[PDB]
């Protein structure tokens, strides 16, 4: 079982990051969403891969 | 640039709302035989 490297990469442009500055936790909220979406990626790669 | 104002608005885009009025206000009315007619005066103009 080659523990191959899966490349997960996410970026948040400065325009979209300063456009939505009205929220005090925008980075935090998108971080949690990405964490959970990576869990779903683990499931979905395990089956659909 | 020292005279120019600076402000730390924490929003990328906004508007500036000024109230103003719609014109003359004071006007006597014949309250004995006429109602006191009331008219709104707030011309909220919005910049960007």
């Amino acid at each position: 079982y080659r523990c191959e490297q899966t490349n997960s990469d996410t970026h948040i442009t400065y325009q979209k990051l300063d456009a939505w500055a009205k929220f005090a936790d925008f980075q935090t909220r998108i971080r949690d969403a990405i964490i959970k979406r990576q869990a779903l990626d683990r499931i979905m790669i395990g089956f659909n891969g | 640039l020292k005279s120019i104002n600076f402000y730390g608005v924490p929003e990328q885009e906004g508007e500036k709302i000024g109230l103003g009025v719609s014109g003359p206000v004071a006007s006597t009315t014949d309250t004995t035989q006429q109602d006191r007619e009331t008219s709104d005066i707030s011309t909220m103009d919005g910049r960007r």
Binding site: F23, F26, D32, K36, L40 | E15
Partner: peptide
Amino acid sequence: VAPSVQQKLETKVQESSDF
């Protein structure tokens, strides 16, 4: 002019990964 909206942030829940 605009009554321009007030916006609150809420996360649309992704599928639960309890599996």
